[PDB]
Design a protein that fits this description.
part of a larger assembly; 10 chains; A mainly alpha; B mainly alpha; C mainly alpha; D mainly alpha; B: Histone, subunit A; C: mainly alpha; Histone, subunit A; 5 helices; DNA-binding; Histone H2A type 1-B/E (chain H); nucleosome core (chain E); structural constituent of chromatin (chain E); isopeptide bond (chain E)
Chain lengths: 100, 87, 109, 99, 84, 100, 98, 55, 87, 100
DNA sequence: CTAACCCTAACCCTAACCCTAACCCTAACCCTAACCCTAACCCTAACCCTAACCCTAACCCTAACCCTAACCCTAACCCTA
DNA sequence: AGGGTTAGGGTTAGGGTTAGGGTTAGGGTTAGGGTTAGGGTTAGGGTTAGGGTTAGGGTTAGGGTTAGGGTTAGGGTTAGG
């Protein structure tokens, strides 16, 4: 295990084990705070978002993204694969009944 | 003064390492290149729907400030009950 | 001629506000008439559920070398209990992660 | 605030008493307390709605212990529903014996 | 007289084949019939348990199409036509 | 010596089209009635069902089976296959959220 | 003993009238009438339930036209919601005028 | 007296029972008070949906 | 600092009598009420298709100003050559 | 009391003649400038247009609208009608080859 | 009796500046997975036809739904601790 | 104060029963083509890093905004015909 080159695929497992034992937010607040304001501009201007609404929005978005990534990973191993692909997210969302 | 507004440097706000860390937290070993754009689009659509619901709730409440209570109400109306933030 | 005013919680043996449950059933636009044993039944069911959830959370906290109950331990106990996971399937606990479940194919050679 | 303001409602005292009864020398957090309050409120609203729907389907106007027991048996799973029904029947018997 | 073991076999193989052809399946595997029968039995068990609970709450001994529709809507499957 | 035997595929396709261009039922009624009676016998004895009730039950079961078969065929097509498999049925039930 | 059988309420006459207003040459079977009766009742129960939830969230013990207009915009999608809102506004304007 | 009794459907221009909608809103345990324009709005929405589906 | 109305003329200006004045130039006597929206839409898509080519022409010379010469050059490509203003 | 109200037709005809016997513009300039600025905002930010450019744009747009209205009126006259219709506009755009 | 009116108290949301420091972007190297070709098997496609069996056409009748007649207890509203 | 409870008879109705023949399934048969096993090709991101854009507080002020309280009047309610 020289510090110059590590075997690809081994550092990702340690990262997965380390990130699966923490509850901190992965998406950052300031980049996410501007996305919420930019979307609400098309509906109605002069809107003031509370400090607790963006937090719940980010939490729900992170949970939905984690669920979608888990579904895509479950769909990936089905075709004798190990990586995700854009053709799998579409099927994972269609089976759930979201895209209809 | 503040003579600027928000732009489209917002879909790019969801950075690549953030999506990579989210996929690693979910349980993904290898992430493809064309996954970030689709994830950003799906997240934008979901945020658009939730923000539209919150705006409708705020307009019905005769107010101009979106609250965490209205956000939780909209999330529960969709089918995603969230705890902690609110009550 | 009031003698004494005994509390409904003491006469029922439970630790839930039967009076508040009855008031919520009367003002919640559920029915014109609200029974007497129905609030006690609902309070007992809610108390049993809360006791089970708190016992599971305390067991998880004791297993995690902690004294206080955190939402992480709550989510862990909920996902561990099959009946609780089947009951609260569409409920996402904030400030809480999933279980470190690694598939066999993702494991290194 | 305290300027002729309004007071909300919660169940923090009941949750703390239940925690102290089921496990002494333990603790809890504010986030856990809020999660427990939201869970209790959600289950309460769901059971109340189920009882109201059952009373409307039965062409009746009173929601009683029978309707609550049916809503519990329909909402809760198996052994949890059985234990909840047993506890509710015990509480009803205690209320009938002493009030 | 009714063989409780001759009821899972009641869902015959050509019936499952015709159902898969109506859905859009060209080739049907051999081990699909048993899993389909098991899933159908579990679903029917749940729906019949809900209907029995509704009938016991209604103080009756006959399961009705109204109670069946109510149970199906409570599970998340609203059915039209049969009832109202 | 030529009955002109059809190659495996055209018969399946025309049968799929014929069964899709129809509104009649497929499963029988008396075996389904016996099955639901045997299932109801495990709860309350001396039960009397209804004709409309068992008809609605058969219709809902046929619709659910059609949806499950459609999801399984979609999963098989995504998995570079044309036939259904019990693993595909299991993955469909796992993604749809029926596993419990 | 006595007759006095219960009368089941249905929207069969209103659906047939709408059919004659739209297509005065087609017919509706009994199964289609029962399907339309269950569709109208399900939508009416969903909108009334959404209006009741809005009246319970905001501390107000009343249901006005704003509560129904909000429940329509929240349940119906896009063009259908706008058309229904326009029809309701036209109806309440004709009622407040005539 | 009472002159004449005009129907609510004729005064509203719709083809839906506004009276039955109001009675269902009053007896459905939805709210203690039921508005006047709310049944007309609901009847108009239901009539438009039924007309679209029938077309 | 910034204008409170961030609508930036959401396809406005094309009013009812403004369309009722351009249609009468051609020879329209009875102008339907469901024509204003379609006219605004076709005007918007035409302006978009022209402004896209104008911006593509102005971005070639590393210039941040749109002149009338680039506008008429982009209009010539679409098939409508204008005389006088460009030159 | 009397104002000698004009029957629907003569006012439209005299307005058509008055607007045809003139060379002035009809659409305003500032709203059109705001519209083209909003449209250009969707491509490159911090853009500065020109007065002659927006004037030529308004002139070309007015000419195109006049031609489209003439084609729609001709289609309506051919269709035994006197008023324009969105179906007539759609057919004119379909024949002219502008599609959507 | 509750919702449309007005004055107004206080709160909470926004505007703006700092100080770096955890984090983000690219480009530098390389390993193993996604994918095409292909070939071997055995699995289910396609009959199939004689036996399983079901629903067609009715009869009945006795257990069950509930209808409307009598009657009272449970539920609510009041006040005030 | 009237909704729910009780006893009572009517009254629809589903289970039980007959038989049969016309529809269809059960278990064994021939054999096609799809499947997962294999090995060869390619580029796809995995992993490290170091230049450096930008984020979390830390700590201010101002004036929009929710609504607390009070007033009052009119629309939903209740009742009978």
């Amino acid at each position: 295990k020289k510090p110059h080159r590590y075997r690809p695929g081994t550092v990702a497992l340690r990262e997965i084990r380390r990130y699966q034992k923490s509850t901190e937010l992965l998406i950052r607040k300031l980049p996410f705070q501007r996305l919420v304001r930019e979307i609400a501009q098309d509906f109605k201007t002069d809107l003031r978002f509370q400090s607790s609404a963006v937090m719940a929005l980010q939490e729900a978005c992170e949970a939905y993204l984690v669920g979608l990534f888990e579904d895509t990973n479950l769909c990936a191993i089905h075709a004798k694969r190990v990586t995700i692909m854009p053709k799998d997210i579409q099927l994972a969302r269609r089976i759930r009944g979201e895209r209809a | 003064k503040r003579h600027r507004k928000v732009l489209r440097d917002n879909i790019q706000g969801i950075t690549k390492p953030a999506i990579r860390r989210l996929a690693r937290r979910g349980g993904v070993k290898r992430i493809s290149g064309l996954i970030y754009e689709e994830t950003r689009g799906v997240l934008k659509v979901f945020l658009e729907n939730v923000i539209r619901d919150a705006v409708t709730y705020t307009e019905h409440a005769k107010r101009k400030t979106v609250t965490a209570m209205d956000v939780v109400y909209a999330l529960k109306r969709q089918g995603r009950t969230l705890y902690g933030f609110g009550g | 001629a009031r003698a004494k005013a005994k509390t409904r919680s003491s006469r029922a043996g439970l630790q839930f506000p039967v009076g508040r449950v009855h008031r919520l059933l009367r003002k919640g636009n559920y029915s014109e008439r609200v029974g007497a044993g129905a609030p006690v039944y609902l309070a007992a069911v809610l108390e049993y559920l809360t006791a089970e959830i708190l016992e599971l959370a305390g067991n998880a906290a004791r297993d995690n070398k902690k004294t206080r109950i955190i939402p992480r331990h709550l989510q862990l106990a909920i996902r561990n209990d099959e009946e609780l996971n089947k009951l609260l399937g569409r409920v996402t606990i904030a400030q809480g992660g999933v279980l470190p479940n690694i598939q066999a194919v993702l494991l290194p050679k | 605030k305290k300027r002729k303001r309004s007071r909300k409602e919660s169940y923090s005292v009941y949750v703390y008493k239940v925690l102290k009864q089921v496990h002494p020398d333990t603790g809890i957090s504010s986030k856990a307390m809020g999660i427990m309050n939201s869970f209790v409120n959600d289950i309460f609203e769901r059971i109340a709605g189920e009882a109201s729907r059952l009373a409307h389907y039965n062409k009746r106007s009173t929601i009683t212990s029978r309707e609550i027991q049916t809503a519990v048996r329909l909402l809760l799973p198996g052994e949890l529903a059985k234990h909840a029904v047993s506890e509710g029947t015990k509480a009803v018997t205690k209320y009938t014996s002493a009030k």
